[PDB]
Scaffold this active site. Structure first.
Site, PDB file in Angstrom:
ATOM      1  N   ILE A  93       7.860  -7.824 -11.221  1.00  0.00           N
ATOM      2  CA  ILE A  93       6.927  -7.661 -10.102  1.00  0.00           C
ATOM      3  C   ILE A  93       7.610  -7.152  -8.840  1.00  0.00           C
ATOM      4  O   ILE A  93       8.695  -7.606  -8.476  1.00  0.00           O
ATOM      5  CB  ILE A  93       6.222  -8.996  -9.674  1.00  0.00           C
ATOM      6  N   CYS A  94       6.950  -6.218  -8.168  1.00  0.00           N
ATOM      7  CA  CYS A  94       7.452  -5.685  -6.922  1.00  0.00           C
ATOM      8  C   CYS A  94       6.488  -6.173  -5.839  1.00  0.00           C
ATOM      9  O   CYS A  94       5.488  -5.521  -5.529  1.00  0.00           O
ATOM     10  CB  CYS A  94       7.487  -4.152  -6.949  1.00  0.00           C
TER      11      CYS A  94
END
Lengths: 201, 201
Positions: A93-94
């Site tokens: 996840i960013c």
């Protein structure tokens, strides 16, 4: 083999808090224990409405750090998803709070709700996946059809493009791995030929 | 190191059938690969309608034997379920075809549909779980509400039973394992005092 008191008490009260939320009662978020020492939980968020993810349920891998609550948990999508800010290969996840904007006041619940908000409002300018981020911007209608297909095959969403699934099937008949074919085609604007070479790379 | 020719070909063919079935397109069943050589798969069946399991999705651990298709696969529920023929503790399945009534003609698809059928019509006279089988026969209304509670908590079916959730929450308030709390209550006809004693054995 336990964590420090401040960490345990935080995770235990935040685990309870999630279990007693109005969002969990409405099946929007949920979390389970995997490891008996609270070092690894398992989450699950529902795909937001009016979104290619609508109908989908996404499992998360939550790993609590020894430094909690001063550092964020490591979150990753277990369920494959097609999103600008999530790696279509690893689930990495960013997102803000999972990197440099985490605050000690945040909770397991808040992280789950925020990952759900992210699904409903991506940031293709701060992507985790360039291939997805780009498609999101260059050909938005193809991204929505691909996200919805990924939601149906991997997250139980209703069902998408018959066209896409005919191509998936054709390439699988050729003996290619299904998951490979899906991300290959999704990365090559759904062109069987250009997708076939990528599968030979 | 893979399986014999006859076994791989069947699994490959059956894995294909599932993906291209009308049932998978309608979100009733589905299977993925967990291992490269096909020895382990992962299924997911939909809770049948007009049932305590409606709205829930159930994951299954499918282990294909070296003797496939002459012996049945080893199927077990990953998602906790309250059913007469399924161990409310380990998820073991008590069913005809998984033991002595298996036929070389059965497939991954048929197994998945049979499991889905079993949820829709239990056989408490050939139970896997005596406690569940009994509650099923002695107190059918409590069974329906306990099954529906287990479906909201582990399968994602709509909410159910404010009374049940409060009793579970109060016992968790004591630091008892939540799943331990839920099975104790469920196994003790939802009597706080007896369940709290079981939680101390």
């Amino acid at each position: 083999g336990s964590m420090a008191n401040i960490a345990v008490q935080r995770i235990k009260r935040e685990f309870k808090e999630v279990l007693k939320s109005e969002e969990t009662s409405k099946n929007q978020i949920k979390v389970d224990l995997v490891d008996e020492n609270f070092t690894e939980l398992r989450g699950e968020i529902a795909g937001p409405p009016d979104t290619p993810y609508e109908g989908g349920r996404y499992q998360l891998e939550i790993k609590i750090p020894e430094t909690y609550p001063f550092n964020p948990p490591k979150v990753r999508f277990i369920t494959k998803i097609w999103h600008p800010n999530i790696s279509s290969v690893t689930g990495a996840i960013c997102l803000d709070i999972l990197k440099d904007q985490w605050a000690a006041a945040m909770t397991l619940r808040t992280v789950l709700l925020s990952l759900q908000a992210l699904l409903a409002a991506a940031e293709p300018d701060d992507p985790q996946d360039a291939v997805v981020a780009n498609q999101y911007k260059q050909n938005p209608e193809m991204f929505k059809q691909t996200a919805r297909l990924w939601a149906h095959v991997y997250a139980g969403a209703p069902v998408s493009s018959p066209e896409y699934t005919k191509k998936i099937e054709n390439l699988c008949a050729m003996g290619f791995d299904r998951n490979a074919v899906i991300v290959a085609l999704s990365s090559k604007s759904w062109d069987v030929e250009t997708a076939t070479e990528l599968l030979l790379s």
